[PDB]
Amino acid sequence: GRQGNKFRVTCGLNNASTVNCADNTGAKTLTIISVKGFHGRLNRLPRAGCGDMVVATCKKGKPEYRKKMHTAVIIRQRRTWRRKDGVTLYFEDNAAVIVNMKGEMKGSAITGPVSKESADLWPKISSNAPTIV
Amino acid sequence: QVCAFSGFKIPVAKGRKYVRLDLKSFTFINKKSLMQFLRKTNPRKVFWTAIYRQLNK
Amino acid sequence: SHRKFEAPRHGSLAFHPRKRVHKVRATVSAFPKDNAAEKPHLTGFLGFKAGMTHVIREVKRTNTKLPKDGVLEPVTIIETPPMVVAGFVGYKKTTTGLKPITAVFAEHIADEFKRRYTKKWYKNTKNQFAVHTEKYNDVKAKSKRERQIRLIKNRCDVVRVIAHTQMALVPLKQKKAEVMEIQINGGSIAEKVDFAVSLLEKQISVNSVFGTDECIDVCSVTKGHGYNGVIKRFGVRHLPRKTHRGLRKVACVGAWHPARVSWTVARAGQMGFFKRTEVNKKIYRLGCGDLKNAKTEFDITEKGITPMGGFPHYGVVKNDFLMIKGTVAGIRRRVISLRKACFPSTTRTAQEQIVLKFIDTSSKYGHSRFQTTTEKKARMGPMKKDL
RNA sequence: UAAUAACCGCAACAGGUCUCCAAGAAGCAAAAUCUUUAGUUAAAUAGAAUAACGCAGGUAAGGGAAGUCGGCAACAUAGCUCUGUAAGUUAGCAAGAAAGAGUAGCUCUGGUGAUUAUCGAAUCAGAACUUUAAAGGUUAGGGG
RNA sequence: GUCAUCUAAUUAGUGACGCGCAUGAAUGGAUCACCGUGAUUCCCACUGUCCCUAUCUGCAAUCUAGUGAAACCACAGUCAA
RNA sequence: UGUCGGCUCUUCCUAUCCAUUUCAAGCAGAAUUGAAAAAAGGUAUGAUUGUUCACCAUUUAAUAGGGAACGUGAGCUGGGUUUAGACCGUCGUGAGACAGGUUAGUUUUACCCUACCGUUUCGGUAGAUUUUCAAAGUAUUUAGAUAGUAGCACAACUCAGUACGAGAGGAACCGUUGUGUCACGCCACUGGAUUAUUCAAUUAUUUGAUCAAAUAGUGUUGAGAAUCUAACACGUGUUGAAAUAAUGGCUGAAAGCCUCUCAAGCCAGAAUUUCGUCUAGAUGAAUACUUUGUCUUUUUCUUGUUACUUUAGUACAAUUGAAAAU
RNA sequence: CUGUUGCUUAUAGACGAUGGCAUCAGAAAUCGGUGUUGUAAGCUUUAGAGUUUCUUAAUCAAUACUCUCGGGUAUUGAAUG
């Protein structure tokens, strides 16, 4: 579902990390279980950065979304990361939006800003993104 | 780029950017200014700030 | 019993044993393969590392998603004042490797080169090359020298120039020069010696050896650390907090039946003053003549490559210098042995042109703001110390 | 002498051994911390360098028990005042449940008495102004 | 053990069923309010437990001047078959 | 001879899970299945259980199987088992028994030799006499017998909705661009530690009050240069030549034909082998100066070496030793 | 020639070792650059809520104005002279 490549973004989100769900699909928070495309190493915890697809679970939300495994995409993170043009930036919170393998967004709205890395990687997120940072 | 708190001219490849939830982003020059910005300190009351040096003299 | 989970081994056995070197200068263990269909040229140089800055560089590569404003890269500054050639030596291919045949030296030798042949100069009589100089013009010596020149052209296959630096042009307290043998890769041995003889006592600039946007290899000695533990030396995993007798060690140092600790087990020891060769290093700015400054087409302010306050622990750079993309092995003031690439890189990033937009000459101490001390006084205006 | 050297422990042993007299600050406090009278500066040797591995005390980007037999160890709450407090119950409790707000400095105002205007006690409440917005130097409950 | 429930995932916990190898009534049966440096499970908060290690201080360790033991010791001390 | 498992770490086997090179299919494509070369590289995160084992939820190119005194307790832990307290169930008249369950139970010593890792000291390699030479001493520049060896994997674009196939579906070669990990570094940019008790503030005690400090074994807080550092910052390992294993072929007999050869002779073909590159490295070589010029030993001076000093003794230029290949 | 020794020597370092200089040796301040923190002490702005005390002068008063981009520190492993 993703289009194009992504540069190095220091993955600040670990396994069992709770992130907000800026999507409007009745889900409040998501805790990361795995990371799609992660290459395993001994004793290493899966890592997620901006624009990274993850497999998460909902421990708080509506009954049709709670206690189930979803497939979110990280749109912003509190970890400071550096762009290739020498820009160092970091958001105020960790957030994600629920998508699927094809990439089509489940919801229709996003609250707050969306990082550039997740916007260009997933075209459907960019259309619903209010502002792209 | 100009620092949000100190108002100093930010050199290239220096400083940090803070993106708030209200869709407003500020780029700072050092952790000295960023910490004072997060405490809601008034740059008009901080003597070494460029903003303070414009209001007076 | 097998190990429960398989993980890569810690450290590299390609560098064992890890013995610290004795001489600061690192002798290059090879040279680019000779081609006999080209004009003879020098294949190496010698410079002293001064420090590192960062340059915003405009990308000339195509089909890459890098930003148009320019990427940010680090660059090392290698001050390379001209070196003086003080002789040349021929080598012959025998059944035990290269065997030097002779070494024809120049008539006049600087005191810097003389210091290499003693350990207490202030007590020495300083009579190095005294007989070689005072008897240089005798008919017996001139005939002997012609024999040495003729011997190389007949029974030799490798020519190297014994070039040395000039300690008077650098902020280092060392007075004795550094001597490097630079091979002459080019035509037949007949025209190699002719090139070598023409170079006696003649200073060679770095621009004569290396070109522009040239990929080179750097050989030097890394920064010393002294005695170090297993965690830093090999990167092994720290033990749990509960562990008796300590945390930072390798728990099992071998099985029973071999009854001897293997050479492959990570052990404590000396990390530090090791010789390393790094390949495929790009040259950004050839700081000779016009390009000796720190100005660019985009940023036309006139400033020196030395940052405000000088390079930390080094001083002020005023001679020719090189801009090396990335990091090189060794701390400031370390001697660096540059050399042309043995395996030239054919990647699109290796052939890509370099166009510098900005060069950072701001102070390397603290959170500096200004580029030049003049513009610092401009923005800050008149202070009160100077009324 | 009556004990970190005179007592018992093989010793000038960080163990043990019954009592009397007892200042100031601060605080609810014979608490922690600092000082006065008195005592002492020596109580199994020092100097140089400032490697690894240790013993004792610490801090940390993003994540927050994913480590582990097990939140083991550490972190975290913590004083006082006002509001407010559940199921359950032997009807006494649970209960400091849980949860929320306030606290500094300077300048003032009022209340609580004795003797016929003066004399005296810290305690409570209130109001402007100011600042780095205030229990937290020490002491000081994690909760369900 | 089988059924619910707790979790993304439950040889764990809780609640049910009971021909229960081999429960059961002052060898006491059932029932817990309050209490417990008692045993078990789950939540919120917090954190170097961990991802993954970095760094600081004191005391040693290192070297030196003085002083100065002990366990142990058939003889000793490089490997492959 | 310290008796389970787990943690840490190294190495070995192939009866190969992946990547590389091949052959076969009831192999159109895609996905697969059977087999050969090949052990240089990689082979994960968690709920429950002391568990090995097991069973689940993921991720991955793959989440292969085993050994090393059932590797590894003067390496750790003490969860289990496996003393001494106590409870229950069954058995026994009773003391007591239970590969039945439950809870609580001290984990000692390396300063010795060797192995391994690093690090010093001393000793030293024989055929050579074109003085434009030869040897010894000191110092520099180089040399490389041997030993180790390092780079892998994935993804995106284009090829291409193309080949193939009725349709459904649906690749690959070259090229380009990134990511992950491992290895080597490095201090520019960003982050962390911070007794420069740096600068500032401030609680308590003591300096008659201000200034300026001290004490609270670093009082505390905010900012915090240097130095170190990042799994948190960033660079390099995209690198060339030949010969090969399995296999596919060329010419070609045996065996008038056929055949890749259990024949002679060739070619192409791997994450392979060797050069090339990197690290350590022995005997060494060249040049500079001090010497010496048939030779040695015992003393002896020096921190040590060489030349050097005394008494000797010994020899004194002149027929030896080469075809190569088959 | 080499070693000891000196620079309380470094690009090095457990100790040796290693690297540099040794009379044009070295070290030291001071000065300028370069950094860190945030405006020093003294007098003035009735800054200033208010209470006193003359009587409508003063005094005391958190904090704040000018001198002040001030003062202090800065190799100790910074860089000129």
Side-chain angles (χ1 to χ4, degrees), chain A residues 70-89:
Chain A
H70 312 281
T71 301
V73 157
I74 311 294
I75 54 162
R76 50 178 130 99
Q77 63 183 13
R78 209 163 322 190
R79 171 93 210 105
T80 323
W81 82 92
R82 327 198 43 180
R83 310 221 163 116
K84 237 45 162 186
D85 41 50
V87 171
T88 320
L89 83 161

Side-chain angles (χ1 to χ4, degrees), chain C residues 85-99:
Chain C
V85 184
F88 65 97
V89 39
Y91 287 84
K92 191 203 192 333
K93 277 151 132 155
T94 87
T95 56
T96 53
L98 291 197
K99 183 212 140 137

